[PDB]
């Protein structure tokens, strides 16, 4: 609920930060730059959802809530700006491999039971090309 | 100048239940609740009443004040959190019940307690664009609070209806402008399955209700180039009297400016009827040339702001239908047992 | 066993901080403490973090790694210490022992909490009590302290009017504190006629659930001189800790916190000081009774009597002769951010003995240059005492 | 002065289920169903997709075609029969996901299968009145057919979004006029409690669907002074292919006029997304100066009719996002077991 | 900076313990350690315990107070340290740093875990990962380590057959361990054709969820001669700790644990030893790939050629001219009690370097008298390294 | 949900342990005696449910689950044998005071929602 509310623009729109001192792009957005610390000047930066599979795994026995999705692809995607993210990939388990170009998609990531909040966010999909 | 209210109407069911009657059952101190929430009692619909009937009563009263043939109404919108059907529309029943059918458009609106005013804006657009001559917007609800919960002290039944027109000779009030502030916020919600809602507790206040109400109030006053001193009366969303007053005081409104708008202490929270009912009571008392600020609020996070000016034609119409305050004082008290019976809170 | 000193203190405002995420808080506290210490992030050799909630609030364990990662201080070692309400004190004490050992010269002891992230904080706070034998049967945290206060009244004749006065002086003191959760005054009638939580306690006898972070920079006394001027250095004379039964029903005497008696007398022994020398104190007043009882257990009064003398003055900046306790609102009015409270208590003594600009409006009169802080975990199962001085 | 569509977009999930797979389970002749309903297969949403995600995909594709900054979108309306929350609005999530927040109005529209087109009219009014520069109207749904019922063969998932602007240079299509026919009709409904709807059977056809669709088509053509010969293409509501064609043929439309609008045979009934999706496919193929007749229908008793003309700017934008037909043919078939798993039809 | 040594070590059985209550586990480890240590309960100045779970299963925080209360050692101070799977070593390191300071002479460092009580342990174990940015999206703990394994294979050409060889050795070694969860041998075909948890890992590449407890008794090197004979005293040369990014997707290189490289290097520097001198090593092999990677990061071989090292069998107990790794079953076969594992690893080195009767059947050949342990929290966000020697 | 299963004989039947070295009785049953510790052995002992109110409180705002019982009397009872326990007391809030004699009663203490396990145990009732 409250935690969902804070990182919505990140999960929904992939909005990270850019350090002008470095030039480096960070996602998720950081409050303190790991290199420059207080010196780093931060501006909000909108990432494109485009990225490539850096590594991946297929989850065969997940929590009871992911029963419909089983087996699913979890992966670490290297985005074209540089940041890496962990997310699921909507594709057949035989079609996934390292280096596959993917694109972020707005999906229903979770729900807090029958009565709680629904949590949306990014899930990657392979590009048509 | 182009767009304005030509008629307004309201309805409140007769049954009430005092805070004391609810607290008694749940082992709470009534005076603590009353002081805390700024609420004394609330409206209870009869078992043969619902959001549709309430909407119809209010719609019919608005037509009386407008003094126009309902065949001229080109759109009916009903904003509620408690539409009787999940699929069949309330607005279609209200249209049939006022004989506006069949040459019109309609839709049922959902946006927590902001749904009623959402439709006012829709009617403003359609009349202003010339797509229709008159539009009706209704905000009505038969709210249900969870038996053990605090929302049980406020959740109540009521509705008010507004007819929007283009004719200076028929306008009793004029829209100077509208503004809306909307975000995605999980402060309060109800999932399709559940009969009673779930809330985030203290997260509902500052980060949601105040954030959206005050931003919308500041946005409209920025849009109009206006200050708190320019407005004669104000009405805000009133989940309880506490929130309403804090917001009014925060913006710099005095009791004389906000008193007419605040009905919750003796009516409760009618959700989508709340601000519409408040505004209707302001219009029952208002004089020519009075400027009103009206700001609504909806969970999931939205607020609609209005800047309205009252016209010469106001006193002509007030007595054409029942005054909000008269409906509010024609009442019959019930105990909790009868209340749970009426509400179908019985298993 | 080298002597340890405080060379910096930093703190966020305590309260309902919705915009300020968890990360924003431990940065704000950490950067503030770094500036005051006048050290660079690279000078931090290690970190010790106080968190009581942990996973229960937000679903997250291994917060130390998270905190170090986001602070941008990797690969410095980061450790989480836990002891319910007195986790900040225990992280200060772990920090003190790592500097004393010689392994680290500069260590950061911080504490953070974010309880406004969960719909019901009551369930997490109750986690400090015995789940099987207290919580299970419906013993809420306020009801446990209300039961202590009842037994105290039964044994020592404390009245509700006397107990209420603690909250009036707390809220009066808190108006002079910009970092306090509550900056308003109250009367005795307002405290007593507040909504009751657990008889005899009312809402105004209880501390609130609050977000907030606070951080100290401890340093070797020899190294401290290099980093700061002697004037702004405050030395840690004693950092003691003791234990009691987790359940209140297992205590030999409920009207006392033995672990506080044990820890405080150990701290007075190493400092070679008596309680009559303490100028200022910061005690765990999550409830009004807990403040009274600690005043007795730290030896500022005899058992039973602290309740009597609390009334008709004393423990105010106004009172000249007597120790002053909780110059900031205390937990009650300044706020109680569980993991950070222990750190905050000590960071107040630092300011008070330092005669810092931060506590200029609530500055207590310091004659001997000594201050003590009592941090309690749960209902007394853990107590951690820290005794500070302006002189080494 | 002139109101028109500046951008449109659409989304269809990848999963399908053939009639044959459903019939097999329930002991029915697939060829009989296929012939009767004029339907071959339908879209099935992934278990991680819902009306909100579908609306967001559409909305995002409409923004690409519009080529405008979403900060300029003044209201977002989402018309659905399957909004994820009973109280928290979808339109806010959509607004947040396209970055139109916070300076906007929004509302979630309910009117069976006509809620989508209801919001187009709302955006038409607000833009035309000058209250907003751009408004977005979405029609999306993840429909539910009862397991044993015939609605299981058609009820499907899909969405389309439309952005409305005043500026001629940005418009790809122009509204010549709109008309609506609304009554109170108990042909089909769903009570708040129930998960699956109830219908009146044969009473749904002639007295309800045809009555409202044909009256609205006749009404628009009277308003605009047209004939079936004046229109280049047409799109009607398509609960099944049978009803759609009957209506088209009844008004005198040839296959060449109605073929693009009819998607149900391979898509199913996407309820509030049906005509929006059909209209989007017409726009994908349409040439400059083409006149479209679009008539929607909603179970409660509603129909919205549109008279649209296609502009020069059409070929510029079509390829800026996925064509409706491309989404429709990018598909993966599933059996009935998988389908009931995905849709949560399992208890 | 006093030198610290270990006088004793006590360990409960590991795994599905239904009969043993939580209080019986800590007692059972504590009493066994006390017997080996030959100290009386009164001789313990302080207790340091680390628990990652923190009654996530139980619902109980303030575990330290509870443990001391039930142990009957009140009012001795007891503290809880937390760092996910590394909570044990961190409790030990905290215990070492108090002895080193001189504030305590005899300290107990313990670890205990109960995961059988909850129906789904998966949710708690995942707590060590970033909840907002890994767990939230469905990244299970085995899937994170499977993603490490995948990238390692992609970069260094490790095959599934090579990786599976790590498990057969572990299970072979575990048959010589009475406290091990699994006392059976397995083949390469059995490991590879086991039920898959997360591709490429199968059930036989993962450590199991398990209950248990282990406690060490640390004392000053000088005082250690009072309680124990010189030949049964093992000396802690150095206790190092480092940090890394909590999320795997934030690492500079996934195939390596920098926090292990940092901590192991610092430990070799203080001991003035090279990795070629280490006789026996206990590494965190929760997912086998974690076993390969730590062998490289502790400097026993170069990056990439870990697969060759095991497929040959260099690390086996029968092998002579190379370091012997995880002679006890290890996390894979001995079992993985999150809070107790960090202690257990060190207690094995203690037994191996003192040629104890407990590891008679799995006794490694000790040439130089050195052993290293590597405990890891989560995916590597925290690593704690302990280096032990028979000679002070 | 194994935790409930282990302390059933205690919660249900009030079975503690008696130290034969001391002679004193401790409840809940302890594995290690706080006075003897290692030089003390334990035998099972059934306590009488009889006891007296040592202290008490009235909970006015409890968790949402105890909505029906609000306000309720929570107390610490000194049992005849010596041990003290905390439990609720079934009596009027105005009738409770320190020293009141009470008797244990078998009651439905809590439930894990509408689908989870029901947890029974002791609650105290005043004597005639
Ligand atoms: C016990 C406790 C939960 C009280 O119940 P609660 O759910 O917090 O009740 P509320 O938050 O609705 O209390 C309303 C007011 O009390 C105030 N308040 C909350 N806890 C308070 C405390 N411990 N002391 C003083 N004021 C307190 C709030 O700021 C709020 O202020 P306002 O309404 O005057 O603007 C609370 O004190 C706690 O968390 N501890
Ligand atoms: C499958 C899983 C859930 C283990 O629990 P499970 O569903 O009951 O499966 P099993 O117990 O049958 O696992 C196979 C066997 O290996 C044992 N085992 C448990 N965890 C194991 C592990 N990590 N590695 C190897 N064997 C393991 C089981 O006890 C079982 O033994 P048994 O057949 O003699 O009873 C697994 O994913 C896990 O817990 N991790
Ligand atoms: Cl810095
Ligand atoms: K609805
Ligand atoms: Na409807
Ligand atoms: Zn930088
Ligand atoms: Zn004994």
GROMACS .gro file of N, CA, C and O in nm, chain E residues 253-317:
model
  260
 1468UNK      N    1   3.010  -0.718  -1.103
 1468UNK     CA    2   3.022  -0.850  -1.163
 1468UNK      C    3   2.944  -0.951  -1.078
 1468UNK      O    4   2.964  -0.958  -0.957
 1469UNK      N    5   2.851  -1.022  -1.141
 1469UNK     CA    6   2.763  -1.118  -1.075
 1469UNK      C    7   2.837  -1.245  -1.037
 1469UNK      O    8   2.798  -1.312  -0.941
 1470UNK      N    9   2.934  -1.287  -1.121
 1470UNK     CA   10   3.005  -1.414  -1.099
 1470UNK      C   11   3.092  -1.410  -0.976
 1470UNK      O   12   3.136  -1.515  -0.929
 1471UNK      N   13   3.114  -1.293  -0.919
 1471UNK     CA   14   3.200  -1.284  -0.803
 1471UNK      C   15   3.129  -1.219  -0.686
 1471UNK      O   16   3.045  -1.130  -0.703
 1472UNK      N   17   3.173  -1.256  -0.566
 1472UNK     CA   18   3.132  -1.190  -0.443
 1472UNK      C   19   3.245  -1.099  -0.397
 1472UNK      O   20   3.342  -1.146  -0.339
 1473UNK      N   21   3.234  -0.970  -0.428
 1473UNK     CA   22   3.338  -0.875  -0.391
 1473UNK      C   23   3.355  -0.872  -0.239
 1473UNK      O   24   3.467  -0.870  -0.191
 1474UNK      N   25   3.244  -0.869  -0.164
 1474UNK     CA   26   3.249  -0.864  -0.018
 1474UNK      C   27   3.331  -0.981   0.040
 1474UNK      O   28   3.394  -0.967   0.145
 1475UNK      N   29   3.334  -1.095  -0.030
 1475UNK     CA   30   3.419  -1.206   0.009
 1475UNK      C   31   3.564  -1.177  -0.025
 1475UNK      O   32   3.651  -1.195   0.060
 1476UNK      N   33   3.591  -1.123  -0.144
 1476UNK     CA   34   3.727  -1.085  -0.181
 1476UNK      C   35   3.781  -0.982  -0.082
 1476UNK      O   36   3.882  -1.009  -0.017
 1477UNK      N   37   3.701  -0.880  -0.052
 1477UNK     CA   38   3.741  -0.775   0.042
 1477UNK      C   39   3.768  -0.834   0.181
 1477UNK      O   40   3.874  -0.811   0.238
 1478UNK      N   41   3.674  -0.912   0.234
 1478UNK     CA   42   3.687  -0.966   0.369
 1478UNK      C   43   3.800  -1.068   0.378
 1478UNK      O   44   3.874  -1.068   0.475
 1479UNK      N   45   3.810  -1.159   0.279
 1479UNK     CA   46   3.914  -1.261   0.282
 1479UNK      C   47   4.054  -1.199   0.274
 1479UNK      O   48   4.143  -1.238   0.349
 1480UNK      N   49   4.071  -1.097   0.188
 1480UNK     CA   50   4.199  -1.029   0.176
 1480UNK      C   51   4.239  -0.965   0.308
 1480UNK      O   52   4.347  -0.992   0.359
 1481UNK      N   53   4.148  -0.892   0.371
 1481UNK     CA   54   4.176  -0.830   0.499
 1481UNK      C   55   4.214  -0.936   0.603
 1481UNK      O   56   4.299  -0.910   0.688
 1482UNK      N   57   4.153  -1.055   0.595
 1482UNK     CA   58   4.180  -1.160   0.694
 1482UNK      C   59   4.317  -1.222   0.670
 1482UNK      O   60   4.386  -1.256   0.766
 1483UNK      N   61   4.357  -1.235   0.544
 1483UNK     CA   62   4.489  -1.287   0.511
 1483UNK      C   63   4.598  -1.188   0.553
 1483UNK      O   64   4.701  -1.229   0.603
 1484UNK      N   65   4.570  -1.058   0.541
 1484UNK     CA   66   4.665  -0.953   0.576
 1484UNK      C   67   4.695  -0.953   0.726
 1484UNK      O   68   4.812  -0.948   0.765
 1485UNK      N   69   4.592  -0.961   0.811
 1485UNK     CA   70   4.611  -0.957   0.955
 1485UNK      C   71   4.679  -1.084   1.004
 1485UNK      O   72   4.766  -1.078   1.091
 1486UNK      N   73   4.644  -1.198   0.944
 1486UNK     CA   74   4.707  -1.325   0.979
 1486UNK      C   75   4.846  -1.336   0.917
 1486UNK      O   76   4.918  -1.430   0.948
 1487UNK      N   77   4.876  -1.250   0.819
 1487UNK     CA   78   5.006  -1.253   0.751
 1487UNK      C   79   5.027  -1.389   0.685
 1487UNK      O   80   5.136  -1.444   0.689
 1488UNK      N   81   4.921  -1.438   0.618
 1488UNK     CA   82   4.915  -1.570   0.558
 1488UNK      C   83   4.868  -1.558   0.413
 1488UNK      O   84   4.799  -1.462   0.379
 1489UNK      N   85   4.905  -1.654   0.327
 1489UNK     CA   86   4.850  -1.660   0.193
 1489UNK      C   87   4.747  -1.773   0.188
 1489UNK      O   88   4.756  -1.868   0.265
 1490UNK      N   89   4.657  -1.771   0.088
 1490UNK     CA   90   4.558  -1.878   0.077
 1490UNK      C   91   4.618  -2.017   0.061
 1490UNK      O   92   4.553  -2.116   0.094
 1491UNK      N   93   4.743  -2.026   0.014
 1491UNK     CA   94   4.810  -2.153  -0.007
 1491UNK      C   95   4.841  -2.222   0.126
 1491UNK      O   96   4.874  -2.340   0.127
 1492UNK      N   97   4.831  -2.148   0.237
 1492UNK     CA   98   4.859  -2.202   0.371
 1492UNK      C   99   4.733  -2.257   0.438
 1492UNK      O  100   4.743  -2.313   0.547
 1493UNK      N  101   4.614  -2.231   0.382
 1493UNK     CA  102   4.489  -2.275   0.444
 1493UNK      C  103   4.471  -2.425   0.424
 1493UNK      O  104   4.474  -2.472   0.310
 1494UNK      N  105   4.455  -2.500   0.533
 1494UNK     CA  106   4.443  -2.645   0.526
 1494UNK      C  107   4.299  -2.685   0.502
 1494UNK      O  108   4.272  -2.777   0.425
 1495UNK      N  109   4.208  -2.620   0.575
 1495UNK     CA  110   4.066  -2.653   0.570
 1495UNK      C  111   3.983  -2.525   0.559
 1495UNK      O  112   4.022  -2.422   0.614
 1496UNK      N  113   3.874  -2.529   0.482
 1496UNK     CA  114   3.789  -2.411   0.463
 1496UNK      C  115   3.641  -2.449   0.467
 1496UNK      O  116   3.602  -2.547   0.403
 1497UNK      N  117   3.558  -2.366   0.530
 1497UNK     CA  118   3.414  -2.388   0.533
 1497UNK      C  119   3.346  -2.272   0.460
 1497UNK      O  120   3.363  -2.157   0.499
 1498UNK      N  121   3.284  -2.300   0.345
 1498UNK     CA  122   3.222  -2.196   0.263
 1498UNK      C  123   3.070  -2.213   0.254
 1498UNK      O  124   3.017  -2.323   0.265
 1499UNK      N  125   3.003  -2.101   0.228
 1499UNK     CA  126   2.858  -2.093   0.216
 1499UNK      C  127   2.811  -2.150   0.083
 1499UNK      O  128   2.810  -2.079  -0.017
 1500UNK      N  129   2.779  -2.280   0.079
 1500UNK     CA  130   2.739  -2.348  -0.045
 1500UNK      C  131   2.590  -2.376  -0.047
 1500UNK      O  132   2.548  -2.488  -0.078
 1501UNK      N  133   2.508  -2.273  -0.024
 1501UNK     CA  134   2.364  -2.291  -0.024
 1501UNK      C  135   2.315  -2.335  -0.160
 1501UNK      O  136   2.216  -2.406  -0.168
 1502UNK      N  137   2.385  -2.295  -0.269
 1502UNK     CA  138   2.339  -2.336  -0.401
 1502UNK      C  139   2.451  -2.390  -0.491
 1502UNK      O  140   2.430  -2.397  -0.612
 1503UNK      N  141   2.557  -2.446  -0.433
 1503UNK     CA  142   2.662  -2.511  -0.512
 1503UNK      C  143   2.745  -2.412  -0.594
 1503UNK      O  144   2.868  -2.413  -0.584
 1504UNK      N  145   2.681  -2.330  -0.678
 1504UNK     CA  146   2.753  -2.226  -0.750
 1504UNK      C  147   2.820  -2.134  -0.650
 1504UNK      O  148   2.935  -2.094  -0.669
 1505UNK      N  149   2.755  -2.113  -0.536
 1505UNK     CA  150   2.808  -2.030  -0.429
 1505UNK      C  151   2.933  -2.095  -0.368
 1505UNK      O  152   3.021  -2.025  -0.318
 1506UNK      N  153   2.939  -2.227  -0.376
 1506UNK     CA  154   3.057  -2.303  -0.338
 1506UNK      C  155   3.175  -2.283  -0.432
 1506UNK      O  156   3.287  -2.255  -0.387
 1507UNK      N  157   3.150  -2.292  -0.563
 1507UNK     CA  158   3.254  -2.266  -0.662
 1507UNK      C  159   3.306  -2.124  -0.646
 1507UNK      O  160   3.426  -2.105  -0.629
 1508UNK      N  161   3.216  -2.026  -0.648
 1508UNK     CA  162   3.256  -1.886  -0.651
 1508UNK      C  163   3.340  -1.848  -0.529
 1508UNK      O  164   3.444  -1.785  -0.545
 1509UNK      N  165   3.302  -1.894  -0.410
 1509UNK     CA  166   3.378  -1.862  -0.290
 1509UNK      C  167   3.517  -1.925  -0.293
 1509UNK      O  168   3.613  -1.865  -0.245
 1510UNK      N  169   3.530  -2.046  -0.351
 1510UNK     CA  170   3.661  -2.108  -0.364
 1510UNK      C  171   3.755  -2.016  -0.442
 1510UNK      O  172   3.866  -1.992  -0.398
 1511UNK      N  173   3.703  -1.950  -0.546
 1511UNK     CA  174   3.780  -1.856  -0.626
 1511UNK      C  175   3.805  -1.725  -0.551
 1511UNK      O  176   3.911  -1.664  -0.567
 1512UNK      N  177   3.701  -1.673  -0.482
 1512UNK     CA  178   3.708  -1.543  -0.417
 1512UNK      C  179   3.794  -1.547  -0.291
 1512UNK      O  180   3.857  -1.447  -0.257
 1513UNK      N  181   3.807  -1.665  -0.228
 1513UNK     CA  182   3.899  -1.681  -0.116
 1513UNK      C  183   4.041  -1.709  -0.164
 1513UNK      O  184   4.132  -1.724  -0.084
 1514UNK      N  185   4.058  -1.716  -0.296
 1514UNK     CA  186   4.189  -1.717  -0.357
 1514UNK      C  187   4.251  -1.854  -0.365
 1514UNK      O  188   4.373  -1.866  -0.380
 1515UNK      N  189   4.169  -1.959  -0.363
 1515UNK     CA  190   4.222  -2.095  -0.375
 1515UNK      C  191   4.240  -2.133  -0.521
 1515UNK      O  192   4.314  -2.226  -0.551
 1516UNK      N  193   4.183  -2.054  -0.612
 1516UNK     CA  194   4.206  -2.071  -0.755
 1516UNK      C  195   4.164  -1.946  -0.832
 1516UNK      O  196   4.105  -1.855  -0.775
 1517UNK      N  197   4.201  -1.939  -0.960
 1517UNK     CA  198   4.172  -1.820  -1.039
 1517UNK      C  199   4.028  -1.823  -1.088
 1517UNK      O  200   3.960  -1.924  -1.071
 1518UNK      N  201   3.976  -1.706  -1.126
 1518UNK     CA  202   3.838  -1.695  -1.171
 1518UNK      C  203   3.816  -1.781  -1.295
 1518UNK      O  204   3.892  -1.770  -1.391
 1519UNK      N  205   3.712  -1.863  -1.292
 1519UNK     CA  206   3.676  -1.947  -1.406
 1519UNK      C  207   3.715  -2.092  -1.389
 1519UNK      O  208   3.640  -2.181  -1.430
 1520UNK      N  209   3.834  -2.119  -1.336
 1520UNK     CA  210   3.879  -2.258  -1.325
 1520UNK      C  211   3.842  -2.317  -1.189
 1520UNK      O  212   3.922  -2.390  -1.131
 1521UNK      N  213   3.718  -2.297  -1.145
 1521UNK     CA  214   3.665  -2.366  -1.029
 1521UNK      C  215   3.611  -2.503  -1.071
 1521UNK      O  216   3.622  -2.599  -0.995
 1522UNK      N  217   3.549  -2.507  -1.188
 1522UNK     CA  218   3.491  -2.630  -1.241
 1522UNK      C  219   3.593  -2.741  -1.257
 1522UNK      O  220   3.564  -2.857  -1.225
 1523UNK      N  221   3.714  -2.706  -1.301
 1523UNK     CA  222   3.821  -2.803  -1.320
 1523UNK      C  223   3.867  -2.855  -1.185
 1523UNK      O  224   3.876  -2.976  -1.165
 1524UNK      N  225   3.870  -2.766  -1.086
 1524UNK     CA  226   3.918  -2.798  -0.952
 1524UNK      C  227   3.832  -2.904  -0.884
 1524UNK      O  228   3.885  -2.987  -0.810
 1525UNK      N  229   3.701  -2.902  -0.906
 1525UNK     CA  230   3.612  -2.999  -0.840
 1525UNK      C  231   3.595  -3.125  -0.925
 1525UNK      O  232   3.588  -3.235  -0.870
 1526UNK      N  233   3.582  -3.109  -1.057
 1526UNK     CA  234   3.560  -3.222  -1.147
 1526UNK      C  235   3.679  -3.318  -1.137
 1526UNK      O  236   3.662  -3.439  -1.144
 1527UNK      N  237   3.796  -3.264  -1.100
 1527UNK     CA  238   3.913  -3.345  -1.068
 1527UNK      C  239   3.903  -3.401  -0.926
 1527UNK      O  240   3.939  -3.516  -0.902
 1528UNK      N  241   3.854  -3.319  -0.833
 1528UNK     CA  242   3.832  -3.362  -0.696
 1528UNK      C  243   3.937  -3.312  -0.599
 1528UNK      O  244   3.946  -3.362  -0.487
 1529UNK      N  245   4.005  -3.202  -0.635
 1529UNK     CA  246   4.114  -3.147  -0.555
 1529UNK      C  247   4.073  -3.118  -0.410
 1529UNK      O  248   4.157  -3.123  -0.320
 1530UNK      N  249   3.948  -3.077  -0.390
 1530UNK     CA  250   3.900  -3.031  -0.259
 1530UNK      C  251   3.857  -3.147  -0.168
 1530UNK      O  252   3.819  -3.123  -0.053
 1531UNK      N  253   3.866  -3.271  -0.217
 1531UNK     CA  254   3.822  -3.386  -0.138
 1531UNK      C  255   3.913  -3.407  -0.017
 1531UNK      O  256   4.023  -3.353  -0.012
 1532UNK      N  257   3.861  -3.476   0.086
 1532UNK     CA  258   3.937  -3.507   0.207
 1532UNK      C  259   4.050  -3.606   0.176
 1532UNK      O  260   4.159  -3.594   0.231
   0.00000   0.00000   0.00000
